[PDB]
Design a protein around this ligand. Structure first.
Ligand SMILES: [Zn+2]
Ligand SMILES: [Zn+2]
Length: 591
């Protein structure tokens, strides 16, 4: 309307050559500005492939893909999951959220105090690299800061790279499609400068937030879910929101926007621009197929949507979701009902504020909130039908009838949270650990996919995944044999590279050359605050597995002929990989 002028013009200028206006574009909730012609931008780890021969016949592994940066996919994901708008909740609900979000910010700001982020802090985090080392780049930033301080935005533009899509089905919760947003690195230092304190100071850490899990490693999440289960109450609920990022309302954004009321002076002016000029009023570049197999880049805008692809995407999403789960708790406890949806009587409004103040600190500790992922153990199973405020906030549950009672789990070991479920297994020496578990077919498939184009880079990435399995998924019979086999087939002095997971709970303790038995012992015994007897483990043969029955359910191939042949001919596979990579220092870990 007014704030997006500076960015549209700069775009028209840069590509005035092939710039044209309005092919029969399909945008409905996005104001169309124009398009321009561009080069379209539309991968197997041999080592893991060689060590996982039985899984060559498994469709879920061989047919795996979740990447789509292709212009065709960019249009597909934008139309169905980005070109969509959630209706605003009625006046009553909006008011209930107001009280709830107010209480939460106060609770987050009880001890921690906000702060601007620094240039050195940004650079320290990165280790693009050859960009931050150029002082010439930082002048461009300095100009933009003054534009923000002036109340204008010039270069901060989102680019819709592609789609992330989980093939629905058996092993994991069917996550819908999501859009992948990348931006100019300069825009990343900004926003981080203004709002990075939420992440860097762990504002939504479990200590500070009570319900969140920011900073907790994926190995910690299991125990956390157990503490929740340890509390008195009904069944444990974990309802997924149907396309969370797509159903963030303007009402919620305003409540999230209450950060500004916690900032002083120049800090607020920098952040005010980020939220209003960059978050609220967006400008997005997206590819689109046209003519005779040619691809153009569209430029569009939208003003009442947060969506995704920001530095605090996780931080805010965690926050709002907590507030949401609190509201649902209130409906479930009888504080509020369907009558107060349209208009909230003050008589009830007070009961809300009283509830948050008195019970909020306890209720929040019955939660496990990591972004859109949520697990809640309410007082009673009345929670299952408390949907009136939930559906009103447009946080409609996925894969269920709009008004069908929610599904709860009696066994916390079956509760899905952050792409895993969590099993408690008893070690050989009598002690017990709570380990993460997930579809093995998915795990091996993701190991098979290499983004690079280099043997060492491939073999290090293979050793990367392998050593991850030893630390987290050692309890899976196939994965432990395959990891030890891969490590044994990769030069012992080679340092793991690349990333094995995108989950924010993946710390990367395995990205080392250290003996993983030490690292395991470090993570699961020494630093594991739920392990009282700190007695170290001597060897892997003391490190427990899950039950066979449980393992096969979760995708194991044990007790099959094809795997059995593979396990006893594992050495042949190792000797091949060694012979291909070449003369280096190898170690036999298969003992
Ligand atoms: Zn800007
Ligand atoms: Zn499992």
């Amino acid at each position: 309307q007014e704030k997006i002028k500076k960015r549209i013009q700069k775009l028209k200028e840069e590509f005035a050559t092939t710039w044209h206006k309005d092919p029969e574009h399909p945008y409905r909730t996005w104001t169309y500005h124009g398009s321009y012609e561009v080069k379209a931008t539309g991968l197997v780890n041999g080592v893991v492939k060689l060590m996982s021969k039985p899984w060559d016949a498994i469709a879920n592994v061989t047919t795996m893909a979740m990447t789509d940066t292709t212009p065709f996919g960019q249009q597909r994901v934008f139309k169905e999951k980005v070109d969509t708008k959630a209706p605003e909740p009625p006046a009553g609900v909006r008011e209930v959220l107001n009280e709830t979000t107010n209480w939460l910010w106060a609770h987050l700001s009880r001890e921690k105090r906000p702060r601007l982020c620094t240039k050195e802090e940004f650079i320290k985090k990165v280790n693009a690299r050859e960009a931050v080392n150029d002082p010439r780049f930082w002048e461009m930033v300095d100009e933009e800061r003054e534009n923000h301080l002036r109340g204008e935005c010039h270069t901060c533009i989102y680019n819709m790279m592609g789609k992330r899509e989980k093939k629905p089905g058996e092993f994991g919760k069917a996550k819908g499609s999501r859009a992948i947003w990348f931006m100019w690195l300069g825009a990343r230092y900004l926003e981080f400068e203004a709002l990075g304190f939420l992440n860097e100071d762990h504002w939504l850490s479990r200590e500070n937030s009570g319900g969140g899990v920011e900073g907790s490693g994926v190995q910690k999440l299991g125990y956390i879910l157990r503490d929740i289960a340890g509390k008195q109450g009904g069944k444990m609920y974990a309802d997924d929101t149907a396309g969370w990022d797509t159903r963030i309302t303007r009402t919620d954004l305003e409540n999230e926007a209450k950060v500004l009321e916690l900032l002083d002076g120049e800090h607020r002016m920098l952040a005010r621009a980020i939220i209003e000029l960059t978050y609220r009023h967006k400008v997005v570049k997206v590819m689109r197929p046209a003519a005779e197999g040619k691809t153009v880049m569209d430029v569009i805008s939208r003003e009442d949507q947060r969506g995704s692809g920001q530095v605090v995407t996780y931080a805010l999403n965690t926050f709002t979701n907590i507030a949401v789960q609190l509201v649902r708790l209130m409906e479930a406890e009888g504080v509020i009902g369907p009558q107060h949806l349209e208009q909230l009587p003050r008589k009830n409004k007070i009961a809300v504020r009283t509830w948050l103040f008195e019970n909020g600190e306890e209720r929040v500790t019955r939660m496990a909130i990591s972004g859109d992922d949520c697990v809640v153990k309410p007082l009673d199973d009345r929670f299952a039908t408390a949907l009136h405020f939930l559906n009103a906030m447009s946080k409609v549950r996925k894969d269920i009838q709009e008004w069908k009672p929610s599904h709860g789990w009696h066994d916390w070991q079956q509760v899905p949270f952050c792409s895993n479920h969590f099993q408690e297994i008893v070690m050989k020496d009598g002690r017990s650990i709570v380990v993460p578990c997930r579809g093995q077919d998915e795990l091996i498939g993701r190991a098979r996919i290499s983004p690079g184009a280099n043997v060492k880079d491939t073999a290090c990435l293979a050793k990367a995944y392998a050593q991850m399995w030893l630390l987290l998924y050692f309890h899976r019979r196939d994965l432990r044999l395959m990891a030890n086999a891969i490590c044994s087939a990769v030069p012992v002095d080679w340092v793991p590279t690349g990333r094995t997971s995108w989950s924010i709970h993946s710390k990367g303790e395995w990205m080392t050359t250290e003996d993983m038995l030490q690292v395991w012992n470090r993570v699961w015994i020494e630093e594991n605050e739920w392990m009282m007897d700190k007695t170290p483990i001597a060897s892997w043969t003391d490190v427990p597995y899950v039950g066979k029955r449980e393992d096969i359910w979760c995708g194991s191939l044990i007790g099959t002929r094809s795997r059995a042949t593979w396990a006893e001919n594992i050495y042949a596979a190792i000797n091949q990989v060694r012979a291909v990579i070449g003369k280096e220092n190898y170690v036999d870990y298969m003992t």
